[PDB]
Amino acid sequence: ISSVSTVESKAYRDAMSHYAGAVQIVTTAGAAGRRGLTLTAACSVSDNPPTILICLQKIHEENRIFIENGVFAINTLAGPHQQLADAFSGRIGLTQDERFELAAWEILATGAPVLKGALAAFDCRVVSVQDHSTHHVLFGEVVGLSSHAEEEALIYLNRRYHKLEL
Amino acid sequence: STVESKAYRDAMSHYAGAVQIVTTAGAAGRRGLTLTAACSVSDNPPTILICLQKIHEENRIFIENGVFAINTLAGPHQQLADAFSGRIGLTQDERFELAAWEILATGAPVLKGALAAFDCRVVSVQDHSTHHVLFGEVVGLSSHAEEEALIYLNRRYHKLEL
Ligand SMILES: Cc1cc2nc3c(=O)[nH]c(=O)nc-3n(C[C@H](O)[C@H](O)[C@H](O)COP(=O)(O)O)c2cc1C
Known about the structure:
2 copies of one chain form a homodimer.
Chain A (H helix, E strand, L loop, with lengths): L8 H8 L4 E2 L1 E5 L6 E5 L2 E6 L2 E8 L6 H6 L1 E6 L5 H7 L7 H5 L4 E2 L7 E2 L4 E13 L2 E13 L4 E6 L2 E6 L1
Antiparallel strand pairs in A: 1-11, 2-3, 2-6, 4-5, 5-10, 6-9, 7-8, 9-10, 11-12
The site of flavin mononucleotide has 14 residues of chain A, from β3 and β5.
Organism (chain B): Brucella melitensis biotype 1 (strain ATCC 23456 / CCUG 17765 / NCTC 10094 / 16M)
Protein name (chain B): 4-hydroxyphenylacetate 3-monooxygenase
EC number (chain B): 1.14.14.9
């Protein structure tokens, strides 16, 4: 099995279009500045201690800001957050500052922007930074937490956004 | 410096997950389990990670075999997900009996009728507290045009139209 080729990137992306993802906006703030981006490549690693990972495209050099600040917050998006998901995916242009202006943010522990009205927010300190081909994989220990009882979760699946009732 | 485990788990119930069954086969035996702690790492080369609890000793079988298939579940797969979660008993063989399986590249069981299946060779195994994190390169692929995805959210299964 070590000698066989990996599948084609296109075929893989097409298959991954069948793999739903809860839409997050991952954020950071600190000496390197404030940045956010719409993200689905994240998951929980452990509950003890609470640890989550995110995958950031290397091709966008501004993603280094997360590493430099050594903190990030994962904000789980709800029904009313389509505009924000679009802003933070680069769909509508705008500067980072202009993108943040579109909603109200607060903080938990690290200073990374936490979305008011998020389904959940996980505020993290970076504990591992890894290079995996096209992406940095950052592991974070969860040092701040919020959750709110919103009616719907924002989910990406089959190349479009969906709202799913909790 | 970290938050409480329970509070974290509770917050994570607001974080939806596409339900997968991850499987393996080889010299160490055949094993499957339901999970949502997986994501795509890269498309070049196609790479996926999975997180496996240490407490379930037999998860070592994935590491020993060095292959796994991630099967993305569709609408009709709720009972199957329940079986492979260990929450309704049954031996491994009894769990596999509840569905039809095939092979792609590695010999790991691939689910017939899955929305997608990603057949992987393990390229890295990492230890992270209570879990192993396995990185797999995708060497086999299947995809089917099923109408709904099985999603876990708010401690319940959901069906989401594609
Ligand atoms: C639904 C969706 C999911 C995304 N997931 C990720 C991700 O997992 N990791 C990542 O680095 N970028 C992801 N992106 C892309 C980033 O949002 C985007 O690269 C970032 O906002 C910077 O875009 P810009 O330079 O055009 O402003 C995703 C985009 C969308 C629309």
